[PDB]
Write a protein that binds this ligand. Structure first.
Ligand code: ADP
Ligand code: ADP
Lengths: 300, 186, 176, 62
């Protein structure tokens, strides 16, 4: 790892993918299919629809396969089919490749209580994972009951992730104590939280902020503000720490149709080092103590 | 062994689309998608002119016609047909022969296929791909990868024979009941 | 190919050991389950518990009862989780003792929140259902396109019910 | 699927030097790098020597 220099090559937002396809993929595939632009034609909007619906990942190879398939069908139609030239349209795309696949850009849009979005820098690029929580035992078995709510974790988490979860649990309990002592929910209630796997082990802790906010949302029941994401390692006191894969998480977030994003103050430079269109239309938020995150996600 | 191998033996291929469509419709029922892909392959092989070959795998329950439809495709394209059972195999040597120095050394089964077919652009059908063992001193998965590499294939070679072989025009079909068990690179 | 497998559940210890009882109902899973399958099973367990809670507060059966469930093996590991909705409905049926509506199947993955996620091998599952003489079938809305890419006869006489959240399913399996 | 290999080819052609790829994923035999002993008949040298032979230059893009 240390013996050379590592150079990053990361992701392609819808615009970048569209440009790549127009200038690079379509001609190369056409040549692979032995065709002429006169005979086969694909509008840009068709490529936009493909990317937005028929391929969901930072890479582009799957888009290559889809465009290759449609060109193959066009070639078959040419050699024998009546049509002498092909002008692909959003109307004919269905017959050319079939009905759409990724109809929903996101898992959902409501984000009920006890679930929050987060950004994971998984090996296969960036992804948006929902971290959810739930109450798997009665909140008040007996109002006297004073035994602390046990916590259970799902997701094949490594001991490092388990410790991060415990830290987040303790800090969330303390924050609820300060903000609302009357609410013992997070204290006297056994809780089960699921953090989807796929995050590279190094990036695992990054979901600490997500876990804390999910637990708080469950405790107060206030659903987190929609079209919101976040990421950050928690400090057991409420200070946030930087994380890696910032560009990858940003591109994944934008692809997920999310608007307001939360990052630690430290990574700020990396967020600005990106391009403009990549950063276009993102209500970013840079924080250093968890209190600001609580204020943001819960405007009241 | 060497001279018996073909060199430039581009076994002739039919190109009448309607002919192949009728042939397949007669030899099998339904199975539309496979016929669609085959017609697309014929059309591209025609427009491109020179014949070529790629790698596609039929995955599904057993005894559904995968082998039968492979035979029908070999018939329709007029090219040779050969099958190779890979499930429960470890030694790539059978795939790659031996060094040719061991006592009673023989070349890799692909060499036998090439000789028997006596052609440069045959059809090969790998049976039960996902049942590879890839265990100790095995891991032929690397050998299969180089075999299916759309570029390394052009200069593939084995242990017994130490000369490159071009296979870009060769047609490969692979069969397996399930998808996931296949190694991701393949 | 496809197959129809009956997920089964039973109570392996007296429900009311103590009317005051404050223990946590255990859960045991059989059928040569992979770790991911065990996590999915626990997710289904927790969601079913919460659903019973919000729906039938008086029913502590699932909360305080040592249950054993058998999921017949054979499902390919990647497809394993697809039995999440089946597990949840089995647990709920046992809890309220109401048998599910006859000649009904289902398949889907549960998300610790009641939302259902798409699954693979829709065609084979549909063929298995049809060969099983089942009339009403339940699938996630997300796989809907796949179910409509199939020929008419294969889909003939199947009263499908596309859903997105487990709530819908609870209204079908238990019409009244 | 980012074009790493494609950009490798682009660098190779732009620099006028040669190109040669290599797969090491899931590999566990040192011989491929260090070849064989040259003693076992049918022994082969390291893949790097073969790349040098094919490109016939010591400034390739490996
Ligand atoms: N759609 C079909 N049309 C014609 N014959 C079929 C069809 N499906 C299955 N068969 C028959 O069933 C048998 C299945 O054997 P086989 O071809 O070995 O199946 P598989 O290819 O799945 O191993 C074949 O003899 C084949 O003729
Ligand atoms: N920015 C880009 N410009 C040109 N081609 C691209 C770009 N991004 C992806 N591709 C194409 O995608 C294909 C993916 O190739 P692949 O070997 O998967 O690359 P990688 O090793 O980065 O995954 C390449 O053939 C390349 O032409």
């Amino acid at each position: 790892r240390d013996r050379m220099e590592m150079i990053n090559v990361s992701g392609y937002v819808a615009q970048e993918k569209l440009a790549i396809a127009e200038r690079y993929l379509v001609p190369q595939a056409r040549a692979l299919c032995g065709l002429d632009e006169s005979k086969a034609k694909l509008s840009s909007d068709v490529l936009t629809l493909l990317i937005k619906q028929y391929c969901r990942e930072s890479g582009v190879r799957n888009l290559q396969k889809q465009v290759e398939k449609v060109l193959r069908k066009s070639a078959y139609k040419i050699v024998s089919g009546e049509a002498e030239s092909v002008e692909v349209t959003p109307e004919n795309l269905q017959d050319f490749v079939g009905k759409p696949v990724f109809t929903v850009e996101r898992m959902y849009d409501v984000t009920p209580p006890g679930v929050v979005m987060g950004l994971a820098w998984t090996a296969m690029g960036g992804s948006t994972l929902f971290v959810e929580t739930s109450l798997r035992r009665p909140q008040d078995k007996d109002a006297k009951g004073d035994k602390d709510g046990s916590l259970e974790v799902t997701g094949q988490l490594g001991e490092v992730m388990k410790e991060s979860a415990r830290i987040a649990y303790t800090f969330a309990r303390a924050f609820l104590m300060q903000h609302a002592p009357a609410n013992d929910y997070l204290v006297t209630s056994h809780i089960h939280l699921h953090v989807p796997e796929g995050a590279t082990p190094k990036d695992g802790p990054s979901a600490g902020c997500t876990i804390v906010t999910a637990l708080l949302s469950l405790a107060m029941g206030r659903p987190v503000r929609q079209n919101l994401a976040m990421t950050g390692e928690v400090s057991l006191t409420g200070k946030i720490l930087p994380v890696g894969g910032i560009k990858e998480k940003t591109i994944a977030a934008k692809r997920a149709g999310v608007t307001c994003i939360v990052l630690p103050a430290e990574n700020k430079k990396d967020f600005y080092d990106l391009a403009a269109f990549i950063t276009e239309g993102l209500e970013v938020h840079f924080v250093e103590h968890y209190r600001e995150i609580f204020d943001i996600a819960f405007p009241d | 062994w060497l001279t018996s191998i073909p060199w430039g033996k581009y076994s002739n291929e039919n190109l009448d689309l309607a002919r192949a469509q009728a042939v397949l419709e007669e030899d099998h029922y339904g199975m539309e998608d496979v016929k669609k892909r085959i017609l697309e392959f014929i059309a591209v092989s025609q427009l491109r002119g020179s014949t070529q070959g790629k790698i596609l795998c039929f995955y599904g329950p057993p005894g559904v016609g995968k082998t039968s439809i492979a035979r029908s495709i070999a018939r329709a394209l007029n090219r040779e047909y050969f099958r190779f059972s890979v499930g429960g195999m470890t030694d790539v040597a059978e795939i790659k022969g031996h060094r040719r120095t061991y006592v009673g050394a023989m070349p890799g089964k692909i060499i036998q296929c090439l000789k028997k077919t006596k052609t440069e652009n045959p059809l090969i059908l790998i049976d039960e791909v996902d049942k590879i063992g890839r265990g100790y001193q095995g891991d032929p998965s690397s050998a299969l990868l180089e075999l299916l590499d759309p570029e390394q294939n052009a200069n593939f070679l084995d242990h017994y024979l130490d000369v490159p072989v071009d296979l870009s025009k060769v047609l490969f079909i692979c069969t397996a009941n399930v998808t996931d068990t296949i190694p991701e690179p393949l």
